[PDB]
Design an enzyme around this catalytic site. Sequence first.
Site, short mmCIF file in Angstrom:
data_model
loop_
_atom_site.label_atom_id
_atom_site.label_comp_id
_atom_site.label_asym_id
_atom_site.label_seq_id
_atom_site.Cartn_x
_atom_site.Cartn_y
_atom_site.Cartn_z
N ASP A 145 -0.80 2.27 12.60
CA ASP A 145 0.15 1.25 12.16
C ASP A 145 0.49 0.33 13.32
O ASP A 145 0.88 -0.82 13.12
CB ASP A 145 1.42 1.92 11.63
CG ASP A 145 2.00 2.92 12.60
OD1 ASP A 145 1.38 3.99 12.78
OD2 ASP A 145 3.05 2.64 13.20
N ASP A 201 5.67 -0.16 5.16
CA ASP A 201 4.21 -0.30 5.18
C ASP A 201 3.86 -1.78 5.20
O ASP A 201 4.54 -2.59 4.56
CB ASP A 201 3.56 0.38 3.98
CG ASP A 201 2.04 0.38 4.09
OD1 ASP A 201 1.51 0.99 5.04
OD2 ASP A 201 1.37 -0.23 3.23
N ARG A 256 0.84 -1.18 0.00
CA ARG A 256 0.00 0.00 0.00
C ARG A 256 0.89 1.23 0.00
O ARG A 256 2.11 1.12 -0.05
CB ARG A 256 -0.89 0.02 1.24
CG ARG A 256 -1.46 -1.34 1.62
CD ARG A 256 -2.13 -1.28 2.98
NE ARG A 256 -1.25 -0.68 3.99
CZ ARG A 256 -1.65 -0.33 5.21
NH1 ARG A 256 -2.89 -0.57 5.61
NH2 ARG A 256 -0.79 0.27 6.03
#
Length: 194
Positions: free
Chosen positions: A137, A166, A128
């Site tokens: 996160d 990510d 992503r």
Amino acid sequence: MLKSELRKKVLHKRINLSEEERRRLSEKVISNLKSLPEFKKSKKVALYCPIKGEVDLTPLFPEVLKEKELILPKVEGNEISLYRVHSPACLGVGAFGIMEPVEGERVNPEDVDFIAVPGVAFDLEGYRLGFGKGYYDRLLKRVKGLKVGVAYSFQVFERLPRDAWDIPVDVLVTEKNVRRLRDGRSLEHHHHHH
């Protein structure tokens, strides 16, 4: 980097999609996701939230509540815990316009079998471009189950410029095709020398 601009340029058209086509494609995603035999086994079904230009998984809540546990992200203090609901009882707006279960059964995110997480843009490998890093996160570090990326093919490319770290998803479901990021390559028994 182009990270911020790439999020923006895609997001601009993402929220431009009309409910006419959008709702019909969302139906396909719903049907696909619900037809997945693994969704039949997955007991904890956690969803992120459709707000900008995601998939209308909101109307699927009644179906989920009927069979499995609908789990939504609740912000108690920067860090997000996951509450399960079996009824449309406790759903109140606590955060920035999104509804969260403030009263109910507190479940740890690592207990979640199946989670549906959308993203601004996706690729064919499972990356992503993120939204905003800081605390959300951290929730992604909690949930290490089946992370299913839910989006439209328009927001999907072949490869994305991977910024840093990510979190990649396990499965990817679109309105047109089913993407699986768990393909195997080769298997050995005792082939490591003789």
